[PDB]
Amino acid sequence: DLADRFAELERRYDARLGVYVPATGTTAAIEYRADERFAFCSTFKAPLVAAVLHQNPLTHLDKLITYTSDDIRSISPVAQQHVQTGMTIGQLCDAAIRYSDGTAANLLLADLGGPGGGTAAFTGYLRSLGDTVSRLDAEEPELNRDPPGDERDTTTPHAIALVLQQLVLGNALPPDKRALLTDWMARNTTGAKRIRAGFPADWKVIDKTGTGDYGRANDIAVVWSPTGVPYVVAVMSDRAGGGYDAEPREALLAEAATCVAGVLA
């Protein structure tokens, strides 16, 4: 009866909702509009950090990057306080995930190199993980701002869930680098009212949120049951009916996550 309950959520919040939870050896996939395109918004920052980790030695994390106040585009809770000092690649990764720092993301994109200030390289990385669907076309903040229906800067709940699965539970990264991404997601500061709010306290939740115009609110997570069984959960939403200024609704995500948690228990 989950399709009906998700539909009820959509009507309640005047929203479009997308949900994907991959199948496991003991559970069926949960899917709702799982193959429809949604804007990444900040959820791209998790695989962006993976791409940076993948393409460089650990010692790269200690490279200091310098930038100016004019490079700050974009909600950047950490970068805003370190113009004078600069930030290391590792500090940028930490900020991009845990504070969803947009300047940190733009700098990591630049670090990947190549056309589109790194967006092509980022998209190439996803392709290397078997994701033929997702695309990144702009940097921060423009990537949050494409109109509904625009294919630019989009993924699908299905595609991003399969990517996150490989990054955290699979072998996309070696154990030491995998641990770094996992730790940063585990200590995320921006997700308390989203997937975390839908799972009981005895479940571990690591996540990366995304927020944008047209009422966009996303969250991608790996969760572990009270006995240690992992699931990947991707929830994406927008409220295009309210136009550019529509307010994102975190409760929609918490409610969808609650539905998911009840099935997985």
Side-chain angles (χ1 to χ4, degrees):
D1 192 60
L2 225 52
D4 287 338
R5 290 157 70 178
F6 291 142
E8 179 180 11
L9 295 178
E10 288 187 313
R11 62 163 165 275
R12 180 176 298 157
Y13 291 94
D14 195 21
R16 185 178 57 122
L17 175 71
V19 180
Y20 194 76
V21 176
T24 69
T26 66
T27 61
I30 301 171
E31 54 196 33
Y32 189 81
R33 309 191 187 278
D35 296 312
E36 298 192 18
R37 296 188 169 278
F38 292 78
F40 269 114
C41 302
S42 290
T43 64
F44 89 100
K45 299 168 179 161
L48 171 64
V49 170
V52 172
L53 288 175
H54 174 251
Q55 305 188 352
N56 300 275
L58 258 7
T59 231
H60 193 236
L61 300 171
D62 306 283
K63 190 151 312 159
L64 186 77
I65 302 301
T66 295
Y67 57 97
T68 67
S69 179
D70 262 69
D71 292 312
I72 303 170
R73 260 101 157 248
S74 111
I75 298 169
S76 307
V78 183
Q80 206 86 246
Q81 297 201 235
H82 296 94
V83 163
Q84 305 172 45
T85 171
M87 286 174 73
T88 65
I89 293 289
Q91 284 167 165
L92 290 169
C93 290
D94 190 307
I97 295 173
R98 303 202 310 112
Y99 289 93
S100 203
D101 188 301
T103 298
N106 286 356
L107 292 169
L108 294 169
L109 279 169
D111 193 62
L112 289 180
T119 59
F122 172 81
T123 303
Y125 179 71
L126 297 183
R127 296 286 182 270
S128 85
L129 301 178
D131 180 356
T132 60
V133 172
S134 307
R135 48 183 296 186
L136 188 69
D137 296 276
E139 74 181 346
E140 290 283 8
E142 290 74 25
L143 67 88
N144 306 298
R145 301 170 180 187
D146 309 296
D150 201 309
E151 294 162 285
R152 284 177 303 156
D153 308 307
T154 58
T155 182
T156 67
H158 193 174
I160 194 57
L162 293 177
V163 166
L164 188 62
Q165 184 167 63
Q166 292 175 251
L167 296 180
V168 175
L169 301 174
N171 64 181
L173 294 165
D176 55 5
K177 288 177 180 175
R178 182 185 323 145
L180 299 185
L181 174 67
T182 301
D183 170 67
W184 287 316
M185 291 181 71
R187 299 180 305 107
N188 178 40
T189 73
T190 71
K193 296 186 168 185
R194 300 182 191 196
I195 289 163
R196 177 72 274 188
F199 280 78
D202 61 340
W203 288 68
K204 184 175 67 138
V205 177
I206 79 176
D207 84 297
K208 175 79 204 69
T209 59
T211 306
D213 294 294
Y214 304 94
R216 286 166 177 145
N218 306 323
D219 196 15
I220 64 171
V222 190
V223 306
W224 283 261
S225 79
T227 302
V229 180
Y231 301 88
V232 175
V233 183
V235 177
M236 309 188 79
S237 77
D238 69 75
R239 300 177 71 231
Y244 190 98
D245 294 348
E247 305 311 329
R249 293 293 324 248
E250 291 194 289
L252 203 206
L253 306 190
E255 284 209 70
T258 304
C259 294
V260 169
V263 170
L264 299 180

Coordinates of all heavy atoms in Angstrom, one line a residue, residues 99-134:
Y99 N 28.4 20.5 6.0 CA 27.7 21.8 6.1 C 27.2 22.2 4.7 O 26.8 23.3 4.5 CB 28.7 22.9 6.6 CG 29.0 22.7 8.0 CD1 30.1 22.0 8.5 CD2 28.1 23.2 9.0 CE1 30.4 21.8 9.8 CE2 28.4 23.0 10.4 CZ 29.5 22.3 10.8 OH 29.7 22.2 12.1
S100 N 27.3 21.2 3.8 CA 26.8 21.4 2.4 C 27.3 22.7 1.8 O 26.6 23.4 1.2 CB 25.2 21.4 2.4 OG 24.7 21.0 1.2
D101 N 28.6 22.9 2.0 CA 29.2 24.2 1.6 C 29.4 24.3 0.1 O 30.1 23.4 -0.5 CB 30.6 24.3 2.4 CG 31.2 25.7 2.3 OD1 31.5 26.1 1.1 OD2 31.4 26.3 3.3
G102 N 28.8 25.3 -0.5 CA 28.8 25.4 -2.0 C 30.1 25.8 -2.5 O 30.5 25.4 -3.6
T103 N 30.8 26.7 -1.8 CA 32.1 27.2 -2.2 C 33.1 26.0 -2.2 O 33.8 25.8 -3.1 CB 32.6 28.4 -1.4 OG1 31.7 29.5 -1.6 CG2 34.0 28.9 -1.9
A104 N 33.0 25.3 -1.1 CA 33.8 24.0 -1.0 C 33.6 23.1 -2.2 O 34.5 22.7 -2.8 CB 33.6 23.3 0.3
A105 N 32.3 22.9 -2.6 CA 32.0 22.1 -3.7 C 32.6 22.7 -5.0 O 33.1 22.0 -5.8 CB 30.4 22.0 -3.9
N106 N 32.4 24.0 -5.3 CA 33.0 24.6 -6.5 C 34.5 24.4 -6.5 O 35.1 24.2 -7.6 CB 32.6 26.1 -6.6 CG 31.2 26.3 -7.0 OD1 30.5 25.4 -7.3 ND2 30.8 27.6 -7.0
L107 N 35.2 24.5 -5.4 CA 36.6 24.3 -5.3 C 37.0 22.9 -5.6 O 38.0 22.6 -6.3 CB 37.2 24.8 -4.0 CG 37.1 26.4 -3.9 CD1 37.4 26.8 -2.5 CD2 38.0 27.1 -4.9
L108 N 36.2 21.9 -5.1 CA 36.5 20.5 -5.4 C 36.2 20.2 -6.8 O 37.0 19.4 -7.4 CB 35.7 19.6 -4.5 CG 36.0 19.7 -3.0 CD1 35.0 19.0 -2.1 CD2 37.5 19.2 -2.7
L109 N 35.2 20.8 -7.4 CA 34.9 20.7 -8.8 C 36.1 21.2 -9.6 O 36.6 20.5 -10.6 CB 33.7 21.4 -9.2 CG 32.3 20.7 -8.9 CD1 31.2 21.7 -9.1 CD2 32.2 19.5 -9.9
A110 N 36.7 22.3 -9.3 CA 37.8 22.9 -9.9 C 39.0 21.9 -9.8 O 39.8 21.8 -10.7 CB 38.2 24.3 -9.3
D111 N 39.1 21.3 -8.6 CA 40.2 20.4 -8.4 C 40.2 19.1 -9.3 O 41.2 18.6 -9.6 CB 40.2 19.9 -6.9 CG 41.5 19.2 -6.5 OD1 42.6 19.8 -6.6 OD2 41.4 18.0 -6.1
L112 N 38.9 18.7 -9.7 CA 38.8 17.6 -10.6 C 39.3 18.0 -12.0 O 39.8 17.2 -12.7 CB 37.3 17.2 -10.7 CG 36.7 16.5 -9.6 CD1 35.3 16.2 -10.0 CD2 37.4 15.2 -9.2
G113 N 39.2 19.3 -12.3 CA 39.7 19.9 -13.6 C 38.9 19.6 -14.8 O 37.8 18.9 -14.7
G114 N 39.3 20.1 -15.9 CA 38.6 19.9 -17.2 C 37.5 20.9 -17.5 O 37.2 21.7 -16.7
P115 N 36.8 20.7 -18.7 CA 35.8 21.6 -19.1 C 34.6 21.7 -18.2 O 34.3 20.8 -17.4 CB 35.3 21.1 -20.5 CG 35.8 19.6 -20.5 CD 37.1 19.6 -19.7
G116 N 33.9 22.9 -18.2 CA 32.8 23.2 -17.3 C 33.2 23.3 -15.9 O 32.4 23.1 -15.0
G117 N 34.5 23.7 -15.7 CA 35.0 23.9 -14.3 C 34.9 22.7 -13.4 O 34.8 22.8 -12.2
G118 N 35.0 21.5 -14.1 CA 34.9 20.2 -13.4 C 33.6 19.4 -13.5 O 33.6 18.3 -13.1
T119 N 32.5 20.1 -14.0 CA 31.3 19.4 -14.1 C 31.3 18.2 -15.0 O 30.7 17.2 -14.7 CB 30.1 20.4 -14.5 OG1 30.4 21.0 -15.7 CG2 29.9 21.4 -13.4
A120 N 32.0 18.4 -16.1 CA 32.2 17.2 -17.1 C 32.9 16.1 -16.4 O 32.5 14.9 -16.6 CB 32.9 17.7 -18.3
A121 N 33.9 16.4 -15.7 CA 34.8 15.4 -15.0 C 33.9 14.7 -13.9 O 33.9 13.5 -13.8 CB 36.0 16.0 -14.3
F122 N 33.2 15.5 -13.2 CA 32.2 14.9 -12.2 C 31.2 13.9 -12.9 O 31.0 12.8 -12.4 CB 31.5 16.0 -11.4 CG 30.4 15.4 -10.6 CD1 30.7 14.9 -9.3 CD2 29.1 15.4 -11.0 CE1 29.6 14.3 -8.5 CE2 28.0 14.9 -10.3 CZ 28.3 14.3 -9.0
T123 N 30.6 14.4 -14.0 CA 29.7 13.5 -14.7 C 30.4 12.2 -15.2 O 29.8 11.1 -15.1 CB 29.0 14.3 -15.8 OG1 28.4 15.5 -15.2 CG2 28.0 13.5 -16.5
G124 N 31.6 12.4 -15.7 CA 32.4 11.3 -16.1 C 32.7 10.3 -14.9 O 32.6 9.0 -15.2
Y125 N 32.9 10.8 -13.7 CA 33.0 9.9 -12.6 C 31.8 9.0 -12.3 O 31.9 7.8 -12.2 CB 33.4 10.7 -11.3 CG 33.6 9.8 -10.1 CD1 34.6 8.9 -10.0 CD2 32.6 9.8 -9.1 CE1 34.8 8.0 -8.9 CE2 32.7 9.0 -8.0 CZ 33.8 8.1 -7.9 OH 33.9 7.3 -6.7
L126 N 30.6 9.7 -12.4 CA 29.4 8.9 -12.3 C 29.3 7.8 -13.4 O 28.8 6.7 -13.1 CB 28.2 9.9 -12.3 CG 28.1 10.9 -11.1 CD1 26.8 11.7 -11.2 CD2 28.1 10.2 -9.7
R127 N 29.7 8.2 -14.6 CA 29.6 7.2 -15.7 C 30.5 6.0 -15.4 O 30.1 4.9 -15.7 CB 30.1 7.9 -17.0 CG 29.2 9.0 -17.5 CD 27.8 8.5 -18.1 NE 27.1 9.7 -18.5 CZ 26.2 10.4 -17.8 NH1 26.0 10.1 -16.6 NH2 25.6 11.5 -18.3
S128 N 31.6 6.3 -14.7 CA 32.5 5.2 -14.3 C 32.0 4.2 -13.3 O 32.4 3.1 -13.1 CB 33.9 5.8 -13.9 OG 33.9 6.1 -12.5
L129 N 30.9 4.7 -12.6 CA 30.2 3.9 -11.6 C 28.9 3.3 -12.2 O 28.0 2.8 -11.5 CB 29.8 4.7 -10.4 CG 30.9 5.4 -9.6 CD1 30.4 6.2 -8.5 CD2 31.9 4.3 -9.0
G130 N 28.8 3.3 -13.5 CA 27.6 2.8 -14.2 C 26.4 3.7 -14.3 O 25.3 3.2 -14.8
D131 N 26.5 4.9 -13.9 CA 25.4 5.8 -13.9 C 25.4 6.6 -15.2 O 26.2 7.5 -15.4 CB 25.5 6.8 -12.7 CG 24.4 7.9 -12.7 OD1 23.5 7.9 -13.6 OD2 24.3 8.7 -11.7
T132 N 24.5 6.2 -16.1 CA 24.4 6.8 -17.4 C 23.3 7.9 -17.5 O 23.1 8.5 -18.5 CB 24.0 5.8 -18.5 OG1 22.8 5.2 -18.2 CG2 25.1 4.8 -18.6
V133 N 22.6 8.1 -16.4 CA 21.4 8.9 -16.3 C 21.7 10.3 -15.8 O 21.3 11.3 -16.4 CB 20.3 8.2 -15.4 CG1 19.1 9.1 -15.2 CG2 19.8 7.0 -16.1
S134 N 22.5 10.4 -14.7 CA 22.7 11.7 -14.0 C 23.6 12.6 -14.9 O 24.4 12.2 -15.7 CB 23.4 11.5 -12.7 OG 22.6 10.5 -11.9

